[model samples]
Target: RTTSQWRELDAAHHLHPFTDTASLNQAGARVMTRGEGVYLWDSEGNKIIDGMAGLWCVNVGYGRKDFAEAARRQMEELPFYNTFFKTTHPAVVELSSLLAEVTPAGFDRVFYTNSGSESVDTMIRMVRRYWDVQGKPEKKTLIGRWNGYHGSTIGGASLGGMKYMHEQGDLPIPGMAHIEQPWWYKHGKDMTPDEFGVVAARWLEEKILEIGADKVAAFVGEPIQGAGGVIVPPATYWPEIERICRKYDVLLVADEVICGFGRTGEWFGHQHFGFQPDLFTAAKGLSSGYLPIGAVFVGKRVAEGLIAGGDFNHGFTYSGHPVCAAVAHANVAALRDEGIVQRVKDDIGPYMQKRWRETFSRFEHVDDVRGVGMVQAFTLVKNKAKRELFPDFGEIGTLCRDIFFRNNLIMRACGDHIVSAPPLVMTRAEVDEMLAVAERCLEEFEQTLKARGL
Candidate 1:
């Protein structure tokens, strides 16, 4: 079908997640047809840079024949299998062992799921169960940072602090709390970055004490708040938060769904941030978005409890689906064998960040530029020095995002912060092209803001 035909059918039947149906139908969805390298072709044959890496997965980029062949081989051998009832397959077992080697220290055990949301939900169950089996079933409340994005499932969303997601479903249910995000750019006007890092970390301690630390099961955060506008915390933030979590004896859960798989330069964001987590969630780049798969890495502390105790009694039907696992095994090999991740740490990550800082930082409306590894973001502001946001928070972002779309760059905007997580395999040429397009879009956004006259 043509792009218009596809859009018409989509409007009639397909409902997208995290979309305003009415607005989307009016605008019509951009029908993506195919991808190669870091570029995608729309149904209309428009070439576009996949700046968000197919929603922050696709680290190996698109059109990798080896990944497709891996899935094909797995399907031929053993297409489907359940890991339940003490049954395990070579695919899952091998992938499980691989994850232990690739993930941060002490994460030897893995509980499989199919998406980041499920992984987060699994973490909640596992964390609570850890305390339960340890004779502290009352320690059940989970704390998340405000504006942090977990998955959209009930448990994941509740653990997340996005108010918009919460507003829709009468959500957050109960037994969840949130602390201020360690967003030094937005909240640290008076204090130095390090000072705000200390202050932000204290919020966790404050919340723990307020709720009575004995009752708190865990504290969860993204090492770099990905969906929260790629808000990179100060160098001091994670260390302090780790200290507080340890002081309170609460489990620290790292939501590495976006920041995992070399997107953060390190294999995991917590590693990049120089802190260890008691548990961490992995998805997205796990299979490079080629297939659906996710896992909750059980650190020694949590694993000891769950392993020693009787059955934990949790998992998904497609827990470590063989095809997905096989593809992910290949994905991991590609990330490691090809030295793609290391290159990002030593090469492209620094190159892209340099462009982002030197170029985007000079834009008139750009209030702040921050990034680590392949993930980066710049904030739009009404006043740059004062760090003042535009009066209508979401409007400017929406306008700028539309401009980015029209310009054939798939940048995302969380509020007014334009963000990108290009494929980890993106070339220097592609990065340069992406920045050029971003500058063009920003220029157009500037005109719109100026025409509105403050």
Candidate 2:
């Protein structure tokens, strides 16, 4: 179909997630036709550097025949099967063993789902069930951080602390609490970032105590708040949070939806920060966005409690679907065998961080630049001294992002923050191209502001 035809059909029938339908209809969506390595080509033949890595999932990049071949082989042999009927397949079994080896110590058990949202929902059920089996059913409340994003389903949204999501459905139904995010740039006043980190982590303990520690089941957070503008916690943060979770005997859960599969320069983000979580949710990079698959890594403590408890009824039909498992198996192997992850750790990650901090920071409205591994972000501010954002913060970001598209870049705007997680397989040369385009777009954005006489 032609681009216009595709747009007309889409606007007529398809409703995109996290989009305003009326506005999107007025401005037709761009139709991407193909992708190779770190670039995507639209229907109009405009090539774009995939800075967000297909929503931060395509860690190994696009156009890998290995992933496709794995799925093909699995489908030919046994395309679909359910793990629910006391049966298993080689694909899922091998993937589970591979996950156990790559994940942090003590995580051997795995629960399957179709996406990060499902995995998070599963986490909620499993956490509560663990407490229930321990005869502490009263410990049902889960704590999360404000601005922390897990996923978009009811349970995932409730556990996430995004106020807008909660406002829509009278969500956060009950038995959920949220503390302040470890965003030093926003909250640090009269204190060093390191000091504020300890303060931020202490908020979890404070909330637990206020709610009565006995009643709180688990405390959940992202290692680096991804959709929340790449908000990286300070060095002193996770350790304090870990200490408190231990002291209170509350389960610690890490939502690794965005930071898992080597996005954080490690197999998992929690490992990057040296924290041990009782359980962690995984998705996105599981199959490098080639297929939809998510998993929950179960630690020893949680597994023990659940194993002892009989008939823990909770799962999905697509749980451990063989084709998805086969693709993920191939994906993990490529990441390990090709040393793509190590490249992110030793080469591209540091190089990109350096460029973002040194070059991108020189932009007129660039307030702060922060990153870890493949993920990076720069905040746009109206006044750097007072930490003031533009009159309507989101508009400027939207405009800048549009300008980036025109300049052949695919950087994403999270409110007034520009963030990107280029594929882990992105070469240094590709990084240079991405950064150059971003610099030009920022220049154009500055000109746009000047033209508006602001």
Best by lDDT: 2
Q: Write the per-residue lDDT of candidate 2 for residues 1-454, one digit (tens) a residue.
A: 8999999998999999999999998899999999999999999999889999999999999899978988899999999989888999999999999988887779999999999999999999999999999999899999998889989989999999899899988899689999999988779887898999999999999999999989999999999999989999899999999999999999999999999999988989998988999999999999999999999999999999999998879999999999999999999988988998888899988988888787677877888789999999988888888877788767889899899988889989988989999899998888888888888888989999889986
Against the hidden reference, what TM-scores do the models get? 0.98, 0.99
**Runs of candidate 2 exceeding 4 Å displacement:** none
Model 1 scores what on Cα lDDT? Answer: 0.91
lDDT of each: 0.91, 0.92
Measured by TM-score, how close is model 1 to the native structure?
0.98
Clashing pairs in 2: none
